[PDB]
Design a protein. Structure first.
Lengths: 69, 30, 138, 81, 161
């Protein structure tokens, strides 16, 4: 019995659900609160929908000398 | 300044909608 | 699942039955007897075999799992049996309860058949205006 | 109503007459005298969908049921999923 | 070793669908997708936020800077931001008011590790509102921002041919 090869390394096998990469690059808390105000999210969104959306549309429509429709 | 009366189509036909499509997703929840 | 593998009603694959809404709400499942190894028809489009165990297939929704009868009684057998599984236990004991075979007599249970007045001249339309004091909540 | 369609008749005998209809109708509840003496119009109806397979067979001699339930669960339409 | 795994429809029972073929569960793919919110919730939703915000970020440029409404721009405010620093914004609260279909109101902090997780019944929800915030907050700073090293990158371009 040669091709009975005792499964040339069993593996263990099933690797896992276990463990075929560490995790996520150490880049993190290099944003800690950095950009907060959706990381102070404690009551907001009403603020960013008058603000952001009055300045994607206030100046965004107006213009000092057309370049018309 | 010269030639600038364009806000009452987004605040309406654009932003007013944002409000209610957001807001009125109160029908789903609040 | 496998580490516990307790099966009975052979199949292989299928994009048919059970999916997300049979955990997050209710469950529904049918069970049965049988003589010797026989190939069946199936709800959800597919088709497999039998022999025994519990003979306990689990099914998406209960209109689905009585149709083993609307053919799975044109293929011998007194006994076929579906209950109601939750994500936790009971109340609604589905083919359980008392006697079985819809067309006998022990008790009467519910039903009634009448409303207030019977089928007779309801040319009489809708009566009172719906008002919290005169027996129209039934 | 929430499942209220009347198939009643007068014989409510159920031999070579009617059986068809997913779960809903566990009757044979013999009222004190109506020929083959099994009667009424349903059992506990809070279980299944909205057929009129309900008549199609065995008399209702008047109407026959259909959808009328409105208040309508999901289990009461296939699709809650 | 076998004909194709120990031959199976699903993880196990064949009365759930999924019909685990390839394109479903070949170690060839299912690993190209689990540092992220496929099987397991790494760190919280916090950080995944911006690799999601950003990657999806510097997209939507040549889509609306090379297919723009009157296209191939000679305006120094296009070949980049221009407006589309609108999409990320029209959709960075297309999200927040979906995390209102999530409430469940807590504060545990378990992005640090304890005993080899499972998050167990990790399926269904089991990510409350104070999670879906720090993601769709990672989204804005991933969207707006991910729009500028698009823009900021000059453009050395390969062409037709
Ligand atoms: C009632 C509404 C209505 C209105 C008012 C508009 C208006 C507009 N549409 Mg439109 N549209 C509509 C209904 C409407 N649409 C419908 C129903 C459809 C489907 C048929 C479309 C399909 C459509 C398409 C395909 C396009 C438009 C486009 C446009 C814009 C054309 C000119 C432009 O560039 O915008 C002027 C202003 C902006 C686009 C936003 C300005 C934001 C800038 C100023 C910010 C940059 C600076 C910086 C990053 C921000 C600083 C923030 C600071 C405070 C921190 C204009 C805003 C076009 C477009 O916008 O492409 C360029 C084109 O995409 N529409
Ligand atoms: C080819 C075209 C065509 C045309 C010209 C129409 C025209 C119409 N359809 Mg229609 N329809 C069509 C194809 C068409 N349909 C097709 C192919 C289908 C399915 C196969 C339908 C299914 C359909 C239904 C079910 C209904 C209509 C209705 C209507 C009428 C409502 C008009 C209206 O102003 O609502 C305006 C629409 C809206 C306000 C909803 C759009 C919401 C969008 C803009 C939100 C975008 C989400 C965004 C990403 C989130 C940003 C967040 C922000 C909100 C904060 C109008 C007659 C309705 C009707 O009968 O009313 C009388 C309704 O019953 N249609
Ligand atoms: C946009 C999508 C659309 C959608 C929603 C689906 C959805 C589905 N398909 Mg599917 N499919 C599609 C388009 C789509 N398909 C197309 C265009 C084809 C080619 C004919 C197929 C061929 C196909 C097969 C053979 C199968 C499915 C299956 C499925 C189901 C599960 C498989 C799965 O999710 O594995 C997870 C998928 C991935 C992990 C995808 C990773 C691939 C990425 C990384 C590609 C990146 C591209 C790279 C940069 C360069 C390529 C450039 C360009 C040529 C694309 C699911 C319902 C399976 C099924 O029937 O149900 C069980 C079945 O195996 N599909
Ligand atoms: C159904 C579609 C159809 C298509 C294909 C288009 C396409 C277009 N229209 Mg348009 N239009 C349409 C219907 C369509 N229209 C209809 C029905 C109306 C009336 C209701 C209009 C009214 C209209 C106006 C007024 C304008 C346009 C304009 C445009 C152009 C700009 C689009 C843009 O920049 O968005 C941004 C685009 C993106 C962000 C694309 C990103 C995602 C895409 C690529 C799809 C994702 C597929 C992806 C690659 C998946 C593959 C696998 C992956 C894993 C690799 C583009 C040529 C503008 C123009 O000026 O034309 C030259 C102009 O503003 N349209
Ligand atoms: C119900 C309405 C009637 C109708 C059908 C319209 C329709 C219109 N008006 Mg208008 N308007 C009206 C009464 C009306 N108006 C009145 C009474 C006033 C004086 C307060 C104005 C002052 C006004 C201005 C300054 C402008 C318009 C403009 C417009 C056009 C763009 C939509 C807009 O942003 O309006 C803006 C409307 C207001 C500021 C009025 C708010 C009053 C409330 C009570 C009405 C809301 C009713 C709603 C259906 C519910 C559209 C054709 C815009 C235009 O010229 O583009 C071509 C321009 O912005 N209107
Ligand atoms: C978009 C959708 C749909 C979906 C959901 C999938 C999903 C899948 N395809 Mg796939 N495929 C599709 C359409 C689809 N395909 C179409 C239309 C074709 C052309 C016929 C193919 C041709 C194809 C081939 C040849 C293969 C796959 C493979 C795969 C699997 C591995 C993906 C991978 O290796 O990431 C890699 C992702 C990257 C981003 C790599 C970067 C690529 C460039 C940019 C470098 C995955 C399950 C592979 C497989 O099944 O297992 C070996 C492989 O053999 N597909
Ligand atoms: C081709 C595809 C896809 C896309 C478009 C991205 C895009 C991105 N990834 Mg990414 N990633 C992917 C697949 C992808 N990833 C896979 C399969 C893994 C598992 C190993 C990762 C693991 C990963 C990590 C750990 C990081 C990123 C980061 C990033 C971002 C930084 C730019 C960069 O150079 O990436 C990183 C370089 C490579 C993935 C090579 C960028 C938005 C970085 C980030 O979030 O902040 C900038 C972070 O460093 N990715
Ligand atoms: C010509 C114009 C315009 C410009 C300047 C760009 C520029 C860019 N696109 Mg892009 N894009 C455009 C129009 C444009 N796009 C349009 C109209 C679409 C329609 C979907 C896309 C869809 C698209 C996708 C899906 C991606 C990009 C990517 C990229 C960037 C990576 C360059 C590269 O090949 O990786 C260099 C890789 C190595 C050196 C390794 C690059 C900055 C990405 C990318 O190219 O990564 C491969 C990402 O793939 N684009
Ligand atoms: C996942 C993800 C995402 C997100 C998504 C989402 C989250 C979405 C959402 C969306 C949404 C969230 C939407 C909404 C819409 C809305 C609507 C659609 C509304 C409305 C409306 C109307 C129109 C109304 C009507 C009415 C009513 C209902 C009341 C009464 C009657 C009337 C008529 C008034 C993205 C893609 C970004 C990417 C990343 C990942
Ligand atoms: C912009 C300033 C950031 C510096 C941090 C100080 C304030 C942080 C804002 C949260 C307000 C409560 O103050 C807090 O800050 C620390 C983080 O540094 C907290 O430490 C922790 O608090 C949370 C409570 O569930 C946990 O999810 C996190 O492990 C961590 O942020 C202490 O519980 C408390 O001191
Ligand atoms: O009316 C539109 C017109 O105005 C813009 C909008 O940014 O900005 C002007 O404002 C600056 C501020 O100093 C002036 O110097 C100069 O006129 C413009 O930068 C310009 O885009 C539009 O042309
Ligand atoms: S009329 Fe129908 S079901 Fe009614 S009593 Fe007869 S058969 Fe029974
Ligand atoms: S008629 Fe009604 S009650 Fe009878 S079976 Fe059909 S749905 Fe059920």
């Amino acid at each position: 019995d040669l091709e009975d090869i005792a499964n040339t390394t069993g593996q263990w096998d099933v690797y896992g659900s276990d463990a075929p990469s560490p995790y996520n690059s150490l880049q993190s808390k290099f944003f800690e609160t950095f950009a907060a105000p959706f990381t102070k999210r404690g009551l907001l969104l009403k603020f960013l929908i008058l603000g952001g959306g009055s300045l994607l549309t206030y100046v965004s429509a107006n213009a000092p000398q057309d370049v018309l429709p | 300044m010269i030639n600038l009366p364009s806000l009452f189509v987004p605040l309406v036909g654009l932003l007013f909608p944002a409000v209610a499509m957001a807001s009125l997703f109160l029908h789903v929840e609040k | 699942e496998l580490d516990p593998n307790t099966p009975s009603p052979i199949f292989a694959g299928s994009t048919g039955g059970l999916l997300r809404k049979a955990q997050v709400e209710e469950f529904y499942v049918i069970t049965w007897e049988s003589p010797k190894e026989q190939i069946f028809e199936m709800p959800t489009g597919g088709a497999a075999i039998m022999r025994e165990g519990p003979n306990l297939l689990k099914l998406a929704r209960k209109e689905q799992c009585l149709a083993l009868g609307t053919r799975l009684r044109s293929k011998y057998k007194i006994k076929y049996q579906f209950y109601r599984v939750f994500p936790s236990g009971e109340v609604q004991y589905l083919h359980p309860k008392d006697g079985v075979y819809p067309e006998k007599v022990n008790p009467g249970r519910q039903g009634v058949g009448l409303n207030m007045r019977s089928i007779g001249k309801n040319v009489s339309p809708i009566e009172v205006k719906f008002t919290g004091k005169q027996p129209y909540d039934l | 109503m929430s499942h209220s369609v009347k198939i009643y008749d007068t014989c409510i005998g159920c031999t070579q007459c009617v059986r068809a209809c997913p779960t809903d109708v566990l009757e044979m509840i013999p009222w004190g005298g109506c020929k083959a003496k099994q009667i009424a119009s349903a059992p506990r109806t809070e279980d299944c969908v909205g057929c009129k397979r309900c008549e199609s067979a065995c008399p209702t001699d008047f109407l026959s049921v259909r959808v009328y339930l409105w208040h309508e669960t999901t289990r009461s339409m296939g699709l809650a999923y | 070793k076998p004909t194709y795994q120990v031959i199976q429809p699903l993880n196990g029972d064949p009365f759930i669908g999924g019909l685990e073929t390839p394109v479903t569960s070949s170690p060839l793919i299912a690993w190209y997708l689990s540092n992220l919110p496929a099987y397991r919730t790494a760190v919280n939703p916090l950080l995944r936020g911006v690799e999601v915000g950003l990657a999806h970020g510097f997209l939507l440029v040549g889509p609306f800077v090379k297919a723009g409404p009157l296209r191939n721009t000679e305006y120094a405010g296009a070949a980049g931001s221009l407006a589309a620093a609108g999409l990320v914004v029209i959709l960075s609260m297309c999200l927040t008011m979906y995390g209102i279909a999530s409430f469940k109101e807590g504060e545990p902090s378990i992005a640090p590790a304890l005993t080899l997780t499972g998050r167990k019944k990790q399926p269904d929800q089991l990510q409350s509102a104070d999670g879906w915030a720090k993601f769709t907050g990672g989204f804005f700073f991933g969207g707006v921002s991910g729009v500028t090293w698009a823009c900021f990158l000059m453009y050395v371009l390969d062409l037709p041919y």
